[PDB]
């Protein structure tokens, strides 16, 4: 049994160290992982009660270490799972939550823990603070007298990140942009488990006794769905942390502000609106897309204002004007090839993508004028500015290119928008399956809206004198 585990581990490391069809490669590492997982005992450490039985002990511990515990409670919400609910009215500008640095789990708490000796010797742990935090969480989970036990015992036992999807759930993402990041996440997590199973030279860790794949998947998913950035002890730069109490807050586009109080050395949340008793207390996780939310947080946000789909574009080395185009882009601080995004909102493109498309479609004479800088206007500075077109001709060409490109990308999809919406009527679809389908539907709705915006712009510029 232990010799067999290490044998399958070595094969997993090799299988995940070769680059790449993508789906075929994914099912291979998936059948390999599900085999190693079958031979293991799930999570090495489990707790006697359900997570909700442990919330009073999390509150007591946070309270004893100086955190704000009054005016809220933990409630199981239908749409977001567990979260915080106000027990009284909260007024705008009220400093509602504060969590002292002592409660946090950081790379700094990791280095000072039983994990320090292995952290000091391992190069992978040194370059990836999130993986180091994942291991710090694992080591402490398995230490019964750990200071962080009231926090670890209230953490979820599973997540809705793609690492937890069944093959049939991921299948729904075939022929989408998002599926590429899902494969990469699966291939990197498996590679990481393999490397670290072999490495696990500090044997004083409770991971020497038991370190399953389910342990690693739980640790990295706990970190990616909950990690927040905090400043360092001196305030020089940003670092990652797991913040107890605070990380019970779900996401909404709400009237709250979060920050770090350097002087009092604590994580702070200020209400920017009055909240009524019995209302859920949320925080803003950031202007993340639904792809970033599904893949790194395990949820799809329906009311996402910031939804977008990734798009790769580059100037062709076979274009006669490649060198001039590349130079104008470099002077504007834009690469010759990169991953851009198409936004659901009007305008679908950023100042950086507008700048790129204008250069991509410039004539030789326009390129020369930009490189000479003999305009009364700094044309490099206004390159991504909608108010300063290079020419109506350039605008017509770039909006034509975008319309055509988005139309082409749309055809690469296996299902229609109506088919996605019909599928979504199945009340028995799993949470994970609904997330994959909404994501697939979302990509198409963004591309369809981008075709329409590009046509409106093409028409507008073809109407100019
Ligand atoms: C930082 S924790 C928030 C507390 C989490 N609900 C729990 O029970 O521990 C983040 C997790 O909450 C969920 N979540 C947060 N906001 C959400 C939302 N608006 N809709 C659905 N799920 C949400 C996802 O499972 C996410 O991975
Ligand atoms: As904070
Ligand atoms: As708050």
How would you describe this structure in keywords?
monomer; about 475 residues; alpha+beta; set domain protein methyltransferase, domain 1; set domain protein methyltransferase, domain 2; four-stranded mixed sheet; three-stranded antiparallel sheet; 12 strands; globular; binds S-adenosylmethionine; binds arsenic; transferase; transcription coactivator activity; protein-L-histidine N-tele-methyltransferase activity; S-adenosyl-L-methionine
What are the SSEs and their pairings?
Blueprint lengths: L1 H14 L6 H17 L12 H14 L7 E6 L3 E6 L8 E6 L4 E2 H5 L4 H6 L1 H5 L1 H13 L7 H4 L14 H5 L6 H22 L13 H14 L1 E4 L6 E5 L7 E2 L4 E6 L4 E6 L8 E4 L6 H8 L10 E7 L7 H10 L5 E7 L7 H10 L3 H9 L19 H20 L5 H7 L7 H31 L4
Parallel strand pairs: 7-10
Antiparallel strand pairs: 1-2, 2-10, 3-9, 4-6, 5-6, 8-9, 11-12
Helix pairs in contact: 1-2, 1-10, 2-10, 7-11, 13-15, 14-16, 16-18, 17-18
The structure holds S-adenosylmethionine and arsenic (2 copies).
Family: Belongs to the class V-like SAM-binding methyltransferase superfamily. SETD3 actin-histidine methyltransferase family.
EC number: 2.1.1.85
GO molecular function: actin binding; histone H3K36 methyltransferase activity; histone H3K4 methyltransferase activity; protein-L-histidine N-tele-methyltransferase activity; RNA polymerase II-specific DNA-binding transcription factor binding; transcription coactivator activity
């Amino acid at each position: 049994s232990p010799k067999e585990i290490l044998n399958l581990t070595s094969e997993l490391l090799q299988k995940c160290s070769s680059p790449a069809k993508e789906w075929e490669e994914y099912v291979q590492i998936r059948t390999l992982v599900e085999k190693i997982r079958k031979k293991q005992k799930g999570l090495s450490v489990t707790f006697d009660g359900k997570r909700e039985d442990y919330f009073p002990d999390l509150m007591k511990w946070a309270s004893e270490n100086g955190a704000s515990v009054e005016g809220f409670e933990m409630v199981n919400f239908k749409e977001e799972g567990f979260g915080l609910r106000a027990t009284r009215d909260i007024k705008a500008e009220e400093l509602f939550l504060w969590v002292p640095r002592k409660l946090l789990m950081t790379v700094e708490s990791a280095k000072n823990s039983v994990l320090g000796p292995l952290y000091s010797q391992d190069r992978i742990l040194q370059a990836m603070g999130n993986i180091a935090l994942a291991f710090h969480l694992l080591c402490e989970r398995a230490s019964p007298n750990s200071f962080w036990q009231p926090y670890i015992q209230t953490l979820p036992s599973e997540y809705d990140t793609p690492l937890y999807f069944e093959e049939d759930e991921v299948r729904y993402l075939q022929s989408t942009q998002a599926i590429h990041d899902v494969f990469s996440q699966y291939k990197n997590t498996a590679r990481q488990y393999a490397y670290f199973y072999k490495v696990i030279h500090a044997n004083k860790l409770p991971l020497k006794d038991s370190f399953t794949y389910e342990d690693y998947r739980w640790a990295v998913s706990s970190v990616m769905t909950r990690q927040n950035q905090i400043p360092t002890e001196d305030g020089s730069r940003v670092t990652l942390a797991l913040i107890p109490l605070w990380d019970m807050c779900n996401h909404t586009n709400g009237l709250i502000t979060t920050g770090y109080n350097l002087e009092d050395d604590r994580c702070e949340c200020v209400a920017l609106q009055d909240f009524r008793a019995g209302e859920q207390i949320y925080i803003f996780y950031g202007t993340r897309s639904n792809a970033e939310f599904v893949i790194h947080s395990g949820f799809f946000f329906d009311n996402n204002s910031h939804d977008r789909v990734k798009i790769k574009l580059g100037v062709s080395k076979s274009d006669r004007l490649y060198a001039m185009k590349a130079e104008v882009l470099a002077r504007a601080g834009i690469p010759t090839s990169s991953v851009f995004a198409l936004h659901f909102t009007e305008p679908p493109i950023s100042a950086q993508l507008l700048a790129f498309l204008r250069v991509f479609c410039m004539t030789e004479e326009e390129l020369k004028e930009h490189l000479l800088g003999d305009s009364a206007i700094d044309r490099i500075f206004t390159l991504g500015n909608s108010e300063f077109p290079v020419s109506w001709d350039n605008e017509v060409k770039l909006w034509t290119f975008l319309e055509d490109r988005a139309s082409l990308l749309l055809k690469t999809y296996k299902t229609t928008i109506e088919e996605d919406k019909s599928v979504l009527k199945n009340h028995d679809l799993s949470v994970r399956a609904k997330m994959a389908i909404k994501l697939r539907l979302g990509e198409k709705e963004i591309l369809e809206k981008a075709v329409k915006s590009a046509a409106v712009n093409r028409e507008y510029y073809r109407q100019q004198m």
